[PDB]
Symmetry: C6
Subunit: 236 residues, 6 copies
Amino acid sequence: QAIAKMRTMIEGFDDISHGGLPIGRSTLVSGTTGTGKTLFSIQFLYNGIIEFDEPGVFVTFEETPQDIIKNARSFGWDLAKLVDEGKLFILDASPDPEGQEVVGGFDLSALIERINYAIQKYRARRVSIDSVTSVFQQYDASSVVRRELFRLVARLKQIGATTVMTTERIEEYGPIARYGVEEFVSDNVVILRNVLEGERRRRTLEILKLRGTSHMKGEYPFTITDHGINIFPLGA
Amino acid sequence: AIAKMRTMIEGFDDISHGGLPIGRSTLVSGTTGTGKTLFSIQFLYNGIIEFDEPGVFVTFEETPQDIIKNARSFGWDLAKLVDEGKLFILDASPDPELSALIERINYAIQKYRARRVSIDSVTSVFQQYDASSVVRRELFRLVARLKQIGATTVMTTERIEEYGPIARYGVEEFVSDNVVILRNVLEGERRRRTLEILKLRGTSHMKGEYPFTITDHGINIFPL
Amino acid sequence: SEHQAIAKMRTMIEGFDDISHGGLPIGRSTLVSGTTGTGKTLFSIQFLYNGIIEFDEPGVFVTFEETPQDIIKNARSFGWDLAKLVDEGKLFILDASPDPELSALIERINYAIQKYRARRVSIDSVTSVFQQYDASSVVRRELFRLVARLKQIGATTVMTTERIEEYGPIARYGVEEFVSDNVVILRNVLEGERRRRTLEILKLRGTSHMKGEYPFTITDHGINIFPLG
Amino acid sequence: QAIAKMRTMIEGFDDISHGGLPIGRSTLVSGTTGTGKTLFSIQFLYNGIIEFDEPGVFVTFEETPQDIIKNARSFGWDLAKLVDEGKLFILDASPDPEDLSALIERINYAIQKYRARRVSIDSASSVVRRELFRLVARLKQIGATTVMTTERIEEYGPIARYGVEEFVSDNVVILRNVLEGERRRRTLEILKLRGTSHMKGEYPFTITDHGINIFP
Amino acid sequence: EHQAIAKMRTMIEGFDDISHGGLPIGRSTLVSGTTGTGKTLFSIQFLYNGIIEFDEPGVFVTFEETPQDIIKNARSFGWDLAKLVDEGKLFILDASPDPEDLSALIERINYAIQKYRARRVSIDSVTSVFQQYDASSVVRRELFRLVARLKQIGATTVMTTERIEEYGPIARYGVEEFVSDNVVILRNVLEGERRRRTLEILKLRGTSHMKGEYPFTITDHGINIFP
Amino acid sequence: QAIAKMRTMIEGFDDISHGGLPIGRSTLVSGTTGTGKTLFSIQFLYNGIIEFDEPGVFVTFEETPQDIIKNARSFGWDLAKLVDEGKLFILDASPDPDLSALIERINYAIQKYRARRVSIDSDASSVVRRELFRLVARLKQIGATTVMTTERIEEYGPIARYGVEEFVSDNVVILRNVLEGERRRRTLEILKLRGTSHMKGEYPFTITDHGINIFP
Ligand SMILES: Nc1ncnc2c1ncn2[C@@H]1O[C@H](COP(=O)(O)OP(=O)(O)NP(=O)(O)O)[C@@H](O)[C@H]1O
Ligand SMILES: Nc1ncnc2c1ncn2[C@@H]1O[C@H](COP(=O)(O)OP(=O)(O)NP(=O)(O)O)[C@@H](O)[C@H]1O
Ligand SMILES: Nc1ncnc2c1ncn2[C@@H]1O[C@H](COP(=O)(O)OP(=O)(O)O)[C@@H](O)[C@H]1O
Ligand SMILES: Nc1ncnc2c1ncn2[C@@H]1O[C@H](COP(=O)(O)OP(=O)(O)O)[C@@H](O)[C@H]1O
Ligand SMILES: Nc1ncnc2c1ncn2[C@@H]1O[C@H](COP(=O)(O)OP(=O)(O)O)[C@@H](O)[C@H]1O
Ligand SMILES: Nc1ncnc2c1ncn2[C@@H]1O[C@H](COP(=O)(O)OP(=O)(O)O)[C@@H](O)[C@H]1O
Ligand SMILES: [Cl-]
Ligand SMILES: [Cl-]
Ligand SMILES: [Cl-]
Ligand SMILES: [Cl-]
Ligand SMILES: [Cl-]
Ligand SMILES: [Cl-]
Ligand SMILES: [Mg+2]
Ligand SMILES: [Mg+2]
Ligand SMILES: [Mg+2]
Ligand SMILES: [Mg+2]
Ligand SMILES: [Mg+2]
Ligand SMILES: [Mg+2]
């Protein structure tokens, strides 16, 4: 009765992970700016819908929904259509253009409930939470958001949602995650890197850990192309 | 594909696969004397001269007098463009002796019908001690308004190591759509300038570092 | 070996009893420190599991991170049925994990140890209760009250701790090596895009032991260590 | 109308800077201890007086005027003679062996009094940035061409002390004294000259009986 | 008298050669090193050899470990410390943390030295006493008060303390500022995946010594160096 | 009339400093523990007395006078005799088991003993910089030639501990004890001498029964 996995259908990832992401748990995807974390979290939901008719909920802390949609057009992923069809729900949690300092955790209490009803309403099995770093920066990484983040993770587990959460790190080789996000999103960790090779950049993906199950180890090269992420498990 | 505006900075539109996405902001970050101000001036100058797209330059530390003077190093006559109403330099530099400023920047953009905006040294208004939440929200307020207005913006930021964080306060990469890094790396005893587009949302682009020079004609980048 | 001063119990974790020259010192505590995903929880589960299966020695597992349910689910990765051992009274999993929405815990632990007549104890991620900037004196005294009680009871204890870098301090709070009798380090070193797992016994009070790093794997049978020499 | 420059006449520097220091602006000269900062700032003034009859003001915060004068004897320069002729003024802003608005109009008074064209100023990051910003602006309005020295503690670390001084400076020169394999090597770099060209990278120099000698 | 400082033999094989005669008499020597380098072993061997070889009584002040554990672990080297305690030649002074006023502590150390007529003293884990008071400079020059007082009685003292890196600062918390006369560094260096133990005498005020690192092993007879 | 020097009579040191230590000024001697700083400062005073009959004052903050005397017996030097003769004074400022008060004690000793040589053995950087500058300023005003030691943590790292001590000193000497391949190598470097020339980089030295011997 060891943990089962959900296929991401992201080229090469299901091989590295030996079958996909552990079902009903959160996986942290951490990486410097521009490593492809958001793209990964979108491809996860998009493939869920197209391949499996599994609805997805995308919670956005950094980008607006309109920009999420616009930026995916270059891959030929018609997110607007999936939203119109009710297969994808983009929950806008991104900063107020007229944002001010507010007190409490009522806003993140209401967020978790908003996320829960979205999941219920759209019958979603897949969830992406994009840019945990950003909501941490909204509350100066106070123990208030740390607690709420933990509450969010537990609720998702309680719901049975399979979740990707993305988060920033500052160096290619250094800590797993800025603000130690892996403490709360702790079951599974994937690290994306964008490493200088001479003057060129080489992207790699690593599954550092998946609790309760097996996976390939170390870094595997990938590219981002017109079809999104392509990872090469046998790549040079 | 998303619509891009040509910078006409030699080499840059090839590296960005057509120029800067219209209606969005781009961070240009670098150590001192890497060519950030020059990039942001050239962006406006070319827009006016080649495409008749008016420009607003917001300066937070250099005075407009020095901006105009330093631009004559490249044979650019910015005073003439200001006299013609094609360029507006907005002085936000401090007296030797931000919400409000945002409305003034809005006003200038509509008044001059500007499509291009450059913001130089905006983080000099903050202080080392400020909470990241405050710095981020105050910067975001400005950038969100520019996006709402339709402007395409270059915003310069500072860094203190050539390989190290993107910018000084650790929030700047979250407020802009795109990220460009200018470097000035020591190789033995020689300096080499490079430009890298680190992040360009919604499009492919050339990756890694590309050498450039600053000459009498401004920035020239060599992608091959 | 016969001629060493400290009595030891066998972990039965393949290769560890060779590296430690007989197993873990009885009645004492052993720190197992490592970056995240090095095998700390697996080591501390395997210790209890083997004690029950091989020697019928009951065990108490104190969890600060994972829920008991997840401990049990994850252990199925290795074909271990922990729920059955809990139902039989041979294993007790003590939940000290964060509630969504230390003296007290010590008494609960002591009660569980006497109730289940446990000889083996694993404390997993105890330093997760502390805050990053809590005083060193505070963290050391808190850990020590726990560990001294366990020694007084006569339990043999594995206590896991976190570290941030593979080559760097023994543990995160810089006091952990002072409350423990023995120190073991698990590493997961990344070099040339490949990871390799190793185990080292850094300090074992009162006896010799093999020195340096030894390779190990995690497979469907748990930890396997390969001691060369 | 691109910025004009003033010749330093420091052997090799006017080649590296394509003509000297930008007129009416301040140039930061930063370096670890004993890199030659005070020497550069004195040669600047000295050559101004001797070669071009341009009066100079030297602002000192730690070294006494007499120590400054004494040390310049090392290079065969008679500063006391120039002070007696009124072609050099050393301004003593040192503390006593038991507020920059004040110091500034002291400098300004001295500039107007001695008809000075060259100034040298020898030796919480938010407040330093703002304070150096204001000092730079005040000298610019007076029309002085200024060398200001600053300290740093590593050869390839921060340019100055707080990581901000280089950003608020129009011009930046870095003096290094790098230790490699038990040997020292002095170099000068013009890192930035806003609004004009200059040679790039480090150039070796020596300090001898004649002052700084740079080899382009 | 009017002579250079004299030394007392440790009888730790190899060490009396490296130190040209032993530890400077009537002064403190800091022995620093990462966890598990052999500091406590050095400090016990020093006292044990004094008792067995010279009939010089010893006092062992313990800040980290319990006396029961110190005695039990010393059996690893064939040393019967309980017998020496029973015979009054060794006193172990317990200052380890309670499982639940340092001026008073110094006075008890003094009293013990006088009661047992000890000529050798070991102070184990200065780092630990620092962690109990959070490196407040109340512990720091209460430490100097201890070093001073030891020097007044003419005790010859080993003080052990922790460091974090093999090639980095001499001692965590800057302990070498107080136990400043003599400094010995024990290292456990990683050579690939193997460990190599070394001992260095960094400094002995007022006298000569060999320089750099010397490898050693820990055996069933304690520390064994070879120059 | 450039700055003159007084001989240390460590023959290698007077060779690389071209004559000795600059007269009437303070020289910072920095190094990790056990590099020979105290020995350098004592040898400076001892040679001054034995070779030139220049009395000396040694100011101690850590070691007791009795220990300074005992330790010097390692080199066959009888400092108790020199104290008894009134050629040397060891001023005890070490703590029991106010910068102005210390300075007046130093001044009083220099007058009492007619001393020409002084050695001084051993939070905010601003405070340190200002106190150290006042100490240095008074000694210079008194006429003393001073060696002042400081500690540092790394062989190749900051010169002293507050990042300011080296900028307040006229002269800087760095002692190193570098560990490489399990062996130690001692070196001495004159980093800076204001107003005068000197050899550059690291020079090997040893400490023997004879004290410091430098071998260019
Ligand atoms: N005509 C020219 N020819 C060559 N290089 C020039 C010319 N004019 C200016 N420069 C260079 O351009 C640099 C100034 O670039 P600038 O855009 O001011 O940099 P920055 O990154 O904004 N630096 P700062 O804001 O001062 O930290 C100077 O340091 C010169 O090296
Ligand atoms: N006649 C000379 N020949 C050679 N070198 C000399 C001569 N006179 C002085 N020097 C050198 O000049 C250096 C002093 O330069 P100086 O301009 O005082 O440096 P600085 O960078 O201002 N140091 P500081 O202000 O104390 O941090 C000395 O350390 C000597 O190495
Ligand atoms: N059509 C495309 N082809 C290739 N690369 C693309 C395309 N669209 C976007 N990208 C790349 O994706 C990057 C942004 O990925 P994203 O997932 O937003 O990064 P982050 O890790 O910062 O979340 C851009 O910097 C660009 O390099
Ligand atoms: N059946 C299996 N085969 C191989 N590896 C496994 C298996 N089950 C778990 N693992 C590995 O064990 C690791 C779990 O380690 P864990 O003990 O939870 O680490 P820690 O407690 O140090 O964070 C996983 O990250 C995974 O790599
Ligand atoms: N009989 C023995 N043979 C070899 N090594 C031993 C023996 N007994 C103990 N040890 C070693 O002694 C080390 C502990 O020494 P200790 O002096 O307590 O270290 P420290 O005080 O520096 O942490 C143990 O980690 C083990 O390596
Ligand atoms: N007779 C001697 N022969 C060789 N070396 C000696 C002699 N006497 C003392 N030393 C050395 O001098 C060093 C003491 O130097 P010292 O000036 O006290 O160092 P610091 O003040 O830099 O800590 C001792 O560590 C020892 O190596
Ligand atoms: Cl790619
Ligand atoms: Cl260039
Ligand atoms: Cl493995
Ligand atoms: Cl030179
Ligand atoms: Cl050994
Ligand atoms: Cl030597
Ligand atoms: Mg993203
Ligand atoms: Mg600029
Ligand atoms: Mg674990
Ligand atoms: Mg100077
Ligand atoms: Mg010990
Ligand atoms: Mg000393």
